[PDB]
Design a protein around this ligand. Sequence first.
Ligand code: 1RI
Length: 259
Amino acid sequence: NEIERVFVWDLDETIIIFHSLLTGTFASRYGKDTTTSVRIGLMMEEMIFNLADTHLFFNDLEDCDQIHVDDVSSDDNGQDLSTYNFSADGFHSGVDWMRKLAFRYRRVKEMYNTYKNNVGGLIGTPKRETWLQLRAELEALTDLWLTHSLKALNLINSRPNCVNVLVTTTQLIPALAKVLLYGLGSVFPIENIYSATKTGKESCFERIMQRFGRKAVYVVIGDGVEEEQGAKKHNMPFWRISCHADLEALRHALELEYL
Ligand SMILES: O=C(N/N=C/c1ccc(Sc2ncccn2)o1)c1cccc(Oc2ccccc2)c1
């Protein structure tokens, strides 16, 4: 490719897998209301899984959790599937089976590239007003974290020589449902999302470097410890993102071309 610097992101523990909300440990650490925080997380995890079951084949692709969306691109005899009836094919729970599985991921990809900047047309209103109301309800507890990290991502996405990728441990379909909904679709191309569920984040890191080559600068930006050791044993500069002030430094270091 033409990319010079690649930023690998691990937005779990804060955005994708925000398990601190549901356990209530987030509310205790930051001194917020426990009951309200869990209610926002329980509503969120519902509207996410409700979209994956009615749009992204969550029940079909529940166990067949791949790692990249283009993995089964070899069994795809590319066809106009605007008429392909998924409810009446040989799918259940396999060269003729992998083709039906591969079509579904391309249909998932079609939904991503189509409604990633127009969610209100994907989930018809008022499901947007109620759900955009949910953002301010949560960003009022996290001090606009998703908005803040979107600034650091758009400060990278607009650079033609720089790019960003995402490496989470959720299954690919639920992770795509969150990235689509949460608004991270404008900064994350769907071809740059990896699911470290069965393989771990280290193997997902090696898979990224093999794609972009050695002439590029790889930087890891995330929170937690799983990707810190995965970025250390691959000599990739790790960027902690725990505090809110650690993000202001990430922007200020990109404003001045220090990265
Ligand atoms: O903001 C978000 N997480 N923040 C997490 C976090 C942990 C530590 C800190 S820093 C801090 N500073 C001061 C006080 C508290 N914490 O932030 C978030 C996560 C997911 C989705 C999300 O948006 C939406 C949008 C639409 C619908 C539903 C959610 C927003």
